[PDB]
């Protein structure tokens, strides 16, 4: 039995006075009896003990409240749905996630076969929605939605996590497709040859991954007569095809971002706009919102010009061909291994252009990292799948080659220029991004860990952290894995970047983006994938005088920014769970996997390893080992584990190389790591 809520008047009086604290509660996934809310001042996170003192609040909900109890909930931000197995002791519903409680389902809603034949529905996934939670029941009451399929397959589990996080994957209604342009061979109206600059004769190319349906940007470089370069970044304008107030705009605001999975993509726009009308496919006249600079070979801006233009791309490179033409500076690459090119242009022009853009991008990278920019890069693996069955065949870690940096530098230049322009035009309504500095309290724990063990790292500033992480060790077989484990330890106290409106924050200290070490930043180069990009596009168009001033209030922009923030968070969590699902299926269908590992932590009966080939973090317990004995020691707050397997002995401490094997178990989506 819980305790009843407080009325609105008391909550308003308490909040205005300052006796009550609002926050977004975070629940530990591994232990569900404890919860945490952030302090307003910036002190240690306020602890919430018990399950009773959470008082029917779920993870992600914002509440109004040293150990404390939750007494009021303003906004319910959780989706209130879960994927679980159906059992008996009404009927009981058990979710896979342990933060959602256990749910009662009425026996009228259950299928007829289930009451007669319970066993045959013992490995089937069901989706249930919580509708009400009583004051006298420890279990919520729910409604059964549908039958997903067999547990452990690919499509039932994918649709289960998409519905559990709230991503709307349903098809577009016809009132959305009625706002699209009509006519199958759409062409540019002849009235746009006067409001736009004609760039159809220049050399324009795109560099995006080979498996990319939609293209958001194009690049160009032209050498001048005094040793300078004219460098242009051209973005497909989705604000021409998305009018304000139409049902297309309401749907695109409803889903802030598009979600990328292992096997498919859940889009933001209709497929016509995402693939044919707006994406910069080669050999077609397209409308773009370009930025054009004149740069020195050292990467210094001498001119800047914004404006609407018309382009015609000549080729579509990938991240694989671009490295070939970078790594062949003085040798003609044969045309057999190149994508098709428009007949007006030659492969020499494109080949020369990639070299010049790489030459500028190297010096821009060096100058940005002298200025203090920080880069914490973890491991991102990519799969190779079966075309017909749809099961994964094999994984390999993605490789961040030079061509992935050549594009990234120019996207940063375009974003910084657009941020300056739209902030200097409208100071009271502008959408910008911000990265706070990391929290000092839980940076201090990393300070006290790394001050020992003879490791000279410092967390005073971002540039200091980057130079410390790079100079101390490199170019050794153990040192690269050492770099990976230190990066994984360092990436934990960092905060997440936020969208915000410039008319509500008062002081100019908050605006600066910490990790890039710049005072102003925004998102302008990906309209098809995000909706904040479309808002920035409209604001920039209003600033240059192409249209009238936005008729949107500065508080509605804050509400829209909060919605885009929560949607981005849900998108990142969904991609993480999809990658984990496909890796578990690969381990089950490819036998035991052998690799090496480094110990990242030690405990009395367990220790954490990091598998070097795959980058996952499993846990290894001494109960599963075939050992005679084990002893735990600590000296100078340094853990040590001694294993007795005349038998031999092994000593394992932090940053020790072991050999591990991954083996699937009888459960559908589980595996285990065992020492070899």
Residue numbers in the entry: 49 to 113, 231 to 254, 265 to 820, 828 to 858
Please give the exact wording used by the authors of the publication that reports this structure:
To understand the presubstrate binding state, we used cryogenic electron microscopy (cryo-EM) to determine the structure of RNA-free HsDis3L2 to 3.4 Å resolution (construct Dis3L2D391N residues 1–858: carboxy (C)-terminal truncation of residues 859–885; and an engineered catalytic mutation of Asp for Asn at residue 391 in Dis3L2). RNA-free HsDis3L2 has a vase-like conformation in which three oligonucleotide/oligosaccharide-binding (OB) domains—two cold shock domains (CSDs) and an S1 domain—encircle a funnel-like tunnel that reaches into the Ribonuclease B (RNB) domain and leads to the active site. The OB domains provide a large positively charged surface, which probably acts as a landing pad for the negatively charged RNA. The overall structure of RNA-free Dis3L2 is very similar to the structure of the mouse Dis3L2–ssRNA complex (MmDis3L2–U13) (root mean square deviation (RMSD) = 1.2 Å, calculated over all Cα pairs). Thus, the apoenzyme is preorganized to bind single-stranded RNA (ssRNA). The vase conformation is the only one observed in the RNA-free form and with long single-stranded 3′ overhangs. RNA-free Dis3L2 is preorganized in a vase conformation to bind RNA substrates (yellow), with a seven-nucleotide-deep tunnel leading to the nuclease active site.
Dis3-like 2 (Dis3L2) is a 3′–5′ exoribonuclease that plays a critical role in human development. Dis3L2 independently degrades structured substrates, including coding and noncoding 3′ uridylated RNAs. Unlike a number of structurally similar homologs, Dis3L2 can degrade structured RNAs independent of external helicase activity. We determined the structures of an RNase R/II family nuclease bound to a series of structured RNA substrates and analyzed the kinetic profiles of wild-type Homo sapiens Dis3L2 (HsDis3L2) and engineered mutants to reveal how this nuclease achieves highly efficient degradation of structured RNA.
